[PDB]
A paper describes a structure:
Adenylyl cyclase 9 (AC9) is a membrane-bound enzyme that converts ATP into cAMP. The enzyme is weakly activated by forskolin, fully activated by the G protein Gαs subunit and is autoinhibited by the AC9 C-terminus. Each membrane AC contains two conserved cytosolic catalytic domains and twelve predicted transmembrane (TM) helices, with cytosolic N- and C-termini of varied lengths and regulatory roles.
To better understand the observed extended density protruding from the nucleotide-binding site, we determined the structure of AC9 in a complex with DARPin C4 and an ATP analog ATPαS (AC9–C4–A) at 4.3 Å resolution. The structure of AC9–C4–A is very similar to AC9–C4–M, with the full model and soluble domain RMSD of ~2 Å and ~1 Å, respectively. The absence of the stretched density observed in all of the forskolin-free MANT-GTP-bound structures indicates that the stretched density in AC9–C4–M and AC91250–Gαs–M map corresponds to the MANT-group. A similar conformational change is also observed in the AC9–C4–A structure, indicating that the overall domain rearrangement is primarily driven by the DARPin C4 rather than by the ligand occupying the active site of the cyclase. The DARPin C4 binds to the C2a domain of AC9 at a site that partially overlaps with the Gαs-binding site.
Residue numbers in the entry:
A (entry chain C): 9 to 136
B (entry chain A): 97 to 197, 217 to 262, 278 to 359, 384 to 552, 566 to 574, 780 to 939, 976 to 1250
Write the structure that this text describes.
């Protein structure tokens, strides 16, 4: 919003893992899908820093499922890039598309393959 | 401005001609009506007064045909002079034989008024003679009518008429001058704007290739046009890339004047790129002693390798010819490669079209590995070479490559003027109508005094409103005035003008409501004053035409049509005749002035339109000029042909990302996103330069993925209250802020670390400008290649520094650690020092 220090502060608390700050900001009308200048998202930052509890807090806070950066990557692609199975599971149970791809033009299968993580590959290859 | 003020009336002829011809028609027609009057109806006792009418008819038709002559283009002024002299004599003669107790004063005063107006408006003569003739005519008429209050009234009528006339004359003159001046400006601007367009197009084609420029000057990308106040990059296959470097380049630059080098390189590269356009291969850029080109970059060609090899041979031929010419023994290392490359433009400052791959580095290295005087072709070049030349294999003795040796004018001000005129002339007309009384001091009607008061109040309020609006008095407050001004649009002007133009007729009828039908002098006086009033109804040229014409005619004559029945009839017929003529005058005259106002407006708008169109083009061109060269050499070339200079000491830093080499994943179609991110990174790097304190730093150019900058040369001004060495330190913190920015972006970069090799040096260098009809500023010297090589022998995240620069910086506060000993070409062994301290774990 106007003078949206709420967005940057919620993002910094999101990748900081400071839960109480995120709760306080949520009580302060924090924009759930507030992003940076580059288009990264609090869910993506939570995937980066591996604060899963922040992932659940944000998804129950009213977060989206196909958040895209300037690189356009959906959080499914980001998590398949990391190698964390639990984050992938808790995001795919929301119903993220697997037949789509970001502007890099590759499915999450490809990014699971080149990042060497098999677990994500069998998880996605069972999907429709 | 004698030439100016002569051409001014050089351009004003046909309008003057048209006014003259209308004047002649009118005077003839009026004389004909008075001949008819004197002949058929009344005055049947004499033929004396019709022969002069007939002769004036014939002199009019004579002038009508006379105007066509060639002894007229510089003699029409005195032609009008002689015609007005004729009219003067005829009018006074028609007056002379009167006062029998044979014509009333109404006809005399009429014919006086039309003579005076056709004098003032159309004849187009200088001011002082016009006014002296007017006053002479006035006095002659008023003293020849004697053959005193009534006479004094007539004289005051003369003065009011003269005021109206002189005002209208001045207005016509000013409006005539201004339109010619404005159209002159509008004519002047177009040629300069066309010149500026050509300069802009030339410079655009200079900084960047033919194909993209011709695609984009139809503004196919609006982002490109807004940026050049954005573009696209591609990837291409099977292209030839050639490099060449001067052998012993430092040797020719031992102790010269740093000037012959600039010119000789100009000539060399002119020959080379001349042969380039004559051989259908496209140059890219140069690095000091290195000149390199590509073939089939913007549009691939089937036989580009042949063009590339022929360029190599032609370069060999040109260098050997120049060696035979000026007698300098030089040879020219050549390298050639074929492969795939992605081409595009990086940055928004000093941006130049360029190409990228591993193949470009491979070609540069294989040039460095070849032998001088022979081109080093590759197996990739040999896949389709058709072996129509000498096949010789030359390999490094210390990849399937071979060696080939060859073969005023303000609308609101006029409102002040004409309101001033209306109020003063109306006030004087009321003065005289009040002055009619000689025997009775008080007027029996009060309505005259009531109307006088209403008029004086309305005129003074309008006057004070106008003077506040024009002078910007704001004597009480601004916002009260503002809501006292905005109302006047198209309708308020119509209505206030209608009232202000009508009201003198009501003023003259102030006195006629009482008795005038008994005595005979009263009615003749009313006729005189009413025509005097009705003629005044033309001034307010800011209004429209038909409104003022109809208003003046109705509210000035129709009341006499009403008072005609209150019964003297023969005087009635003559006075309706004179008023018919008078309205005939006013219609044409007011039309003639409204059209001139309209055309003046139609001109001034386009004048300012073109004036605003030129300015953006000028600023755009100046910005592009600033894009390429420094301002100093720009203003120096404004009086010169070339540029060349030396500096005995200057600092320079080189910097390039090192871990970019693994980041060329090409799974994506084109791999364009990574270079996009690089583009925002370098754009941020340029935005860093935008700080006002950064006037001491010169980013030379972008070199592939690298970044080179210098300092301490733009400072041509030296002060004794200053230390002339602070440029080196400030450039050192410039490197520091570069380090900080790349660290911050690495933080903001998603899962990839960016590290860079950076090296610093300082020494004597030289500067010059190369391209002609193209442009490129560049630097050479002994320490530039040394700094590049030492930066090549650098460590990531470490500021490698030359030994002498280390010495000059150690006492400045910064602390370093010795790294090791590095042997470098040209200067031999050299020591190396590192700025970062305790960065790693050990």
């Amino acid at each position: 919003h106007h003078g949206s220090d709420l967005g940057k502060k919620l993002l910094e608390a999101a990748r900081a893992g400071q839960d109480d700050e995120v709760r306080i900001l949520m009580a302060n009308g924090a924009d759930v899908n507030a992003t940076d200048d580059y288009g990264h998202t609090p869910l993506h930052l939570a995937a980066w820093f591996g604060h899963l509890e922040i992932v659940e807090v944000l998804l129950k806070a009213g977060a989206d499922v196909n958040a895209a950066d300037w690189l356009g990557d959906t959080p499914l692609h980001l998590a398949a890039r990391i190698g964390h199975l639990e984050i992938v599971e808790v995001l795919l149970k929301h119903g993220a598309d697997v037949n789509a791809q970001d502007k890099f033009g590759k499915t999450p299968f490809d990014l699971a393959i080149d990042n060497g993580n098999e677990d994500i590959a069998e998880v996605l290859q069972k999907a429709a | 401005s004698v030439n100016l003020e002569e051409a001014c009336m050089e351009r004003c002829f046909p309008q003057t001609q048209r006014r003259f011809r209308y004047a002649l028609f009118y005077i003839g027609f009026a004389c004909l009506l008075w001949s008819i009057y004197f002949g058929v109806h009344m005055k049947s006792k004499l033929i004396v007064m019709v022969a002069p009418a007939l002769c004036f008819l014939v002199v009019c038709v004579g002038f009508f045909l006379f105007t066509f002559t060639k002894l007229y283009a510089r003699h029409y002024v005195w032609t009008s002079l002689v015609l007005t002299l004729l009219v003067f004599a005829l009018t006074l003669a028609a007056q002379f034989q009167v006062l029998t107790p044979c014509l009333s004063q109404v006809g005399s005063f009429s014919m006086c008024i039309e003579v005076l107006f056709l004098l003032y408006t159309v004849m187009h003569l200088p001011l002082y003679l016009s006014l002296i003739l007017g006053v002479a005519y006035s006095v002659l008429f008023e003293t020849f009518g004697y053959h005193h209050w009534e006479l004094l009234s007539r004289a005051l009528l003369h003065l009011c008429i003269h005021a109206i006339g002189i005002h209208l004359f001045i207005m016509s003159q000013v409006r005539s001058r201004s339109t010619f001046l404005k159209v002159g400006q509008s004519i002047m601007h177009g040629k300069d704007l066309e010149v500026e367009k050509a300069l802009k197009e030339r410079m655009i084609h200079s900084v960047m290739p033919r194909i993209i420029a011709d695609d984009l000057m139809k503004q196919g990308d609006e982002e490109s046009e807004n940026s050049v106040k954005p573009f696209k990059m591609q990837q291409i296959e099977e292209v030839s890339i050639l490099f060449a470097d001067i052998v012993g380049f430092t040797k020719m630059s031992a102790n010269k004047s740093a000037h012959a080098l600039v010119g000789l390189l100009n000539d060399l590269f002119g020959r080379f790129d001349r042969l380039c356009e004559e051989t259908k291969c496209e140059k890219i850029s140069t690095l000091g002693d290195c000149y390199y080109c590509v073939a089939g970059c913007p549009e691939p060609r089937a036989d580009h390798a042949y063009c590339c090899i022929e360029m190599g041979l032609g370069m060999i031929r040109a260098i050997e010819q120049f060696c035979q010419e000026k007698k300098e023994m030089v040879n020219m290392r050549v390298g050639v490669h074929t492969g795939t490359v992605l081409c595009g433009i990086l940055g928004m400052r000093r941006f130049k079209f360029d190409v990228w791959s591993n193949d470009v580095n491979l070609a540069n290295l294989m040039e460095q590995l070849g032998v001088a005087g022979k081109v080093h072709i590759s197996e990739a070049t040999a896949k389709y070479l058709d072996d129509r030349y000498e096949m010789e294999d030359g390999k490094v003795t210390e990849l399937k490559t071979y060696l080939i040796a060859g073969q005023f004018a303000s609308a609101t001000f006029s409102s002040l003027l004409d309101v001033l005129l209306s109020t003063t002339v109306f006030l004087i007309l009321s003065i005289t109508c009040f002055l009619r009384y000689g025997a009775a001091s008080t007027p029996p009607p009060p309505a005259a005094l009531a109307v006088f008061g209403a008029a004086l109040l309305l005129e003074i309020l309008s006057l004070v409103v106008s003077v506040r609006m024009v002078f910007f008095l704001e004597d009480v407050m601004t916002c009260t005035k503002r809501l006292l001004e905005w109302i006047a649009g198209w309708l308020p002007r119509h209505f206030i003008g209608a009232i202000l133009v009508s009201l003198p007729a009501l003023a003259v009828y102030s006195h006629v409501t009482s008795e005038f039908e008994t005595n005979i002098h009263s009615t003749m006086f009313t006729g005189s004053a009413v025509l005097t009033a009705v003629v005044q109804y033309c001034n307010f040229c800011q209004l429209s035409s038909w409104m003022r014409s109809s208003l003046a005619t109705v509210v000035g004559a129709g009341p006499l049509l009403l008072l005609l029945y209150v019964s003297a009839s023969l005087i009635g017929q003559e006075v309706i005749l004179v008023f018919f003529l008078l309205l005939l005058l006013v219609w044409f005259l007011n039309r003639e002035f409204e059209v001139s106002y309209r055309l003046h407006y139609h001109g001034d708008v386009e004048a300012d339109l073109h004036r605003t169109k030129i300015q953006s083009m000028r600023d755009q061109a100046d910005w592009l000029l600033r894009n390429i060269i420094p301002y100093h050499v720009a203003e120096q070339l404004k009086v010169s042909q070339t540029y060349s200079k030396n500096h005995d000491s200057g600092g320079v830093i080189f910097a390039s990302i090192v871990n970019f080499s693994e980041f060329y994943e090409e799974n994506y179609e084109g791999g364009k996103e990574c270079y996009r991110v690089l583009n925002e990174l370098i754009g941020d790097f340029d935005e860093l330069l935008s700080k006002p304190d950064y006037s001491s730093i010169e980013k030379i150019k972008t070199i592939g993925a690298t970044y080179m900058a210098a300092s301490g040369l733009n400072a041509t001004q030296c002060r004794d209250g200053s230390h002339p060495q602070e440029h080196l330190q400030i450039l050192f913190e410039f490197a520091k802020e570069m380090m900080r920015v790349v660290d911050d972006f690495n933080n903001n970069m998603l899962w990839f670390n960016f590290k860079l090799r950076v090296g610093f040096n300082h020494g004597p260098l030289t500067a010059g400008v190369i391209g002609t009809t193209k442009l490129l500023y560049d630097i050479w010297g002994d320490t530039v290649n040394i700094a590049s090589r030492m930066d090549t022998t650098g460590v990531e995240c470490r500021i490698q520094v030359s030994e002498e620069s280390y010495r000059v910086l150690s006492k400045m506060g910064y602390e370093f650690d010795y790294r090791g000993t590095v042997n470098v070409k040209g200067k031999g062994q050299m020591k190396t020092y590192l700025y970062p301290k305790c960065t790693d774990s050990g």
